Amino acid sequence: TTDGVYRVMTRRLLGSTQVGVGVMQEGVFHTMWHVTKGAALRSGEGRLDPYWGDVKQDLVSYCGPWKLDAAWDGLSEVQLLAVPPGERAKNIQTLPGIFKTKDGDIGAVALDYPAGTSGSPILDKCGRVIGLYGNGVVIKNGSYVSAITQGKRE
């Protein structure tokens, strides 16, 4: 339960397949809903049970409520701490674009990584998590542009 970024793995398929990524912060595990699909997780001898989740926001928290509250300022560059399947965690600095929707504008990272990278945190200059990578759109050139998905803190 130490704070940090974690791989989300499964043994249901061939070998150990990485289905996604998530953030442990303040005893709560945060990830994209499509990674676990709300299922319980294992952390050595311990077990993480879901606490909050939403399919539209595509988010889910384990052990407690969503703790991440920081946001992109619309101006500065961010870093995607990408954790790719079978590959070492690595920070990729980019300047986000905009997903323009009827309910508002959202930041967007135009980096392409395998779908098992879903749940990797997007960071600001203070190392604060401003969102999760993994939910976006496929553009004209086949590549992926993911939204900067952040939940609510109560």
Partner 1 sequence: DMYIERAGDITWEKDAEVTGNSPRLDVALDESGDFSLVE
Binding site for ligand A1B82 (CB under 6 A): 34, 58, 113, 115, 117-118, 134-135, 144, 146
**Residue 1 CB, nearest approach to ligand A1B82 (Å):** 26
DSSP 4-50: EEEEEEESSSSSSEEEEEEEEETTEEEE-HHHHTT--EEETTEEE-E
Residue 145 or 154: which CB sits closer to ligand A1B82? 145
**Residue 65 CB, nearest approach to partner 1 (Å):** 19
Residues 2-21 close enough to bind partner 1 by CB under 8 A: 2-12, 19, 21
- Going from the C-alpha of 71 to that of each of 4, 89, 122, 148, the distances in angstroms are 18, 22, 10, 9
**9 exposure class (CB count in 10 Å sphere: 0-12, 13-18, 19+):** middle
Where do contacts with partner 1 occur on this chain (CB under 8 A)?
2-12, 19, 21-25, 29, 33-34, 36, 39-43, 48, 54-58, 77, 79, 81, 83, 89-103, 108-111, 121, 123-127, 129, 135-137, 139, 145, 147
